[PDB]
Design a protein around this ligand. Structure first.
Ligand SMILES: [Cl-]
Ligand SMILES: [Cl-]
Ligand SMILES: [Zn+2]
Ligand SMILES: [Zn+2]
Lengths: 365, 365
């Protein structure tokens, strides 16, 4: 396989379905990436992640650079070997979590110091991990932001995008075997989104993320921004909506041209008791499930729904049992992959608009 | 298969190897039973429990009678269906944990009230769960105990053993499909152990447990009591040492005629970071494992040791990750089953004495 090749097999409106070929495997798009925090997709063996249909996972860099450390992971053979996942991994840059999870941060044009992470160091860490898709290092913009502050932040992020590109290209093994994505910023402002898209396309990347939209703005506003933002990106490269989202967010984002997604919702909310079903989410802790012998979802093909009842999982989650988290997480990740499969198939068959309508009618009934 | 048939295939000294045939499966002896607290072997799917080699698991009655409740489990189809384990289950009587985990207990000849559990109610609960091996309800004797108090407690337990036998026999479906074990008591006193054995043999049971020896007395004293106690039990029925134990406790207990074991050590201590190896236990949290690429044990055939390093599991346990508990527990239960397999094979081949010597020399090196 090549280092990177994105091919679009079918289209419907702004929606696309296809494949990304990389050295470590093929990624079917639109794709959902389960999130690995601290070199594990929480409560799942990697074989179980694969059994749900995932082609690629996201690794959070911020935690790994702290524990066990990027140089240590490299010494041990890289993240793939360390965690037992041999397919593609996309790594975030670490910049978002440095701001949310650190203390005593100090920002500057060089990077961020916290209790330093620069564009150059972020790319090097992602190299040491052995990432297949490397994210440029950027300054995520708070929401809401004034136009002046959104512009300042976006401009710095574009300067940082060039530094990330040059750092990646300087390292032969990384440039030859991995891919690099740039991140569009600009908050909710069309002119800033356009300037950011233009800057990123001038530098040139293997794929383009829409950054800064998993920030509490609400679905209507997210969709309004995607409406004008996604068409600004190069059509022939993947479009990655970072940090999104709920099932209906994913469907609407695909309708607007997004090809890749990641979120902690299926894993984190699974451990909390929320299960996704075609008839909407349920909270398995609710007393109404204590004697319900049906599986989490009537149609789901996952290994949990073939074997275990709502009543049993209700008991496990109420009791704080590890198996409860295991079963909820496997089901939820499987549900997300089944959603992506239905999206891909419906685009291929030219019936995605109908699928989205049917999906919403039943999910929100 | 029959309701219950114990057959001894080979002997060496006091040690025996053979099989118990029951309706739901065959149990290879000597056997180790993983402990299911609250209808789950903590951090393992039942298919994974089976993959380690376990033929039978222990279900704790005390937790289940409280949450989700015995009548509810029966309404949902029984414990086997509820938790997805279709092979034999041995249930404890609930009497031990009522004393350790309850508040406001009041004891009487009728049973124990706590914030009632009688012999009759304990047998009924184990019926409602659908237990395959039912334990008589008894009064576990504290250690140390005076001869007078040990005698009083043992005598009550024998009266309770008769009540348990009669309750079990009164319920046709239970009498025809399950088995009933009695429990020898008497603390560390040979004369009381003999009176208890005689009382139990007069009533008649399908198997005989040695009770009251998982109580902090130390291995030398445990072995001293087993030396005289096990020969008092009927030779042609299984001998079950409740709540034991460490690997070397198991080996020495088999040398003294024990056929069945259960313990929380491999599961509970696994979640805490202790891994069993042929060269003794290790604590994977120790900094010395942070860059160790070897598996938990060099010879272990389990799925964890085929794939994951000490360094990775060290990271997971230090980070509090669920996968750490999953991997440690699967390895430890697999180690225990491999120990039992080596015990069974060595008895069958008439080289168990040599195996025990070799095992101890390496485990304690
Ligand atoms: Cl998560
Ligand atoms: Cl346990
Ligand atoms: Zn499912
Ligand atoms: Zn192992």
């Amino acid at each position: 396989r090549p280092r990177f090749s994105f091919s679009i097999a079918a289209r419907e409106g702004k929606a696309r379905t296809g494949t990304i070929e990389m050295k470590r495997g093929v990624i079917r798009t639109p794709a959902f990436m389960p999130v690995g925090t601290a070199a594990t997709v929480k409560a799942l063996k990697p074989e179980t992640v694969r059994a749900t249909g995932a082609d690629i996972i996201l690794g959070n860099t911020y935690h790994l650079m702290l524990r066990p450390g990027a140089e240590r992971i490299a010494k041990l053979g890289g993240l793939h070997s360390f965690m037992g996942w041999d397919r593609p991994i996309l790594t975030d840059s670490g910049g978002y979590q440095v701001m949310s999870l650190s203390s005593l941060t100090k920002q500057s044009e060089e990077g961020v110091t916290f209790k330093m992470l620069s564009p150059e160091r972020s790319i090097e860490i992602q190299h040491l991990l052995g990432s297949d898709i490397v994210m440029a290092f950027d300054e995520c913009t708070p929401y809401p932001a004034t136009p002046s502050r959104a512009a300042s932040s976006m401009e710095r992020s574009m300067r940082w995008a060039k530094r990330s590109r040059d750092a990646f290209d300087s390292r032969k093994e990384q440039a030859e075997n991995a891919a690099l994505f740039g991140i569009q910023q600009g908050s909710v402002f069309e002119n800033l989104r356009q300037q950011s898209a233009d800057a990123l396309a001038e530098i040139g990347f293997d794929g383009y993320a829409v950054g800064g939209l998993a920030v509490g703005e609400g679905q209507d506003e997210m969709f309004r921004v995607l409406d004008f933002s996604v068409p600004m990106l190069p059509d022939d490269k993947p479009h990655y909506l970072m940090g999104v989202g709920k099932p209906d967010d994913i469907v609407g984002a695909v309708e607007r041209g997004i090809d890749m997604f990641d979120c902690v919702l299926p894993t984190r909310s699974g451990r909390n008791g929320q299960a996704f079903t075609w008839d909407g989410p349920i909270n398995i802790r609710n007393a109404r499930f204590s004697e319900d012998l049906k599986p989490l979802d009537s149609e789901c093909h996952c290994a949990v729904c073939q074997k275990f009842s709502r009543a049993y999982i209700h008991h496990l989650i109420r009791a704080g049992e590890i198996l409860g988290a295991m079963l909820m997480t496997e089901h939820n990740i499987a549900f997300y992959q089944q959603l992506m499969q239905k999206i891909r198939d419906s685009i291929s068959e030219g019936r995605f608009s109908q699928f989205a309508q049917d999906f919403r009618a039943r999910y929100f009934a």
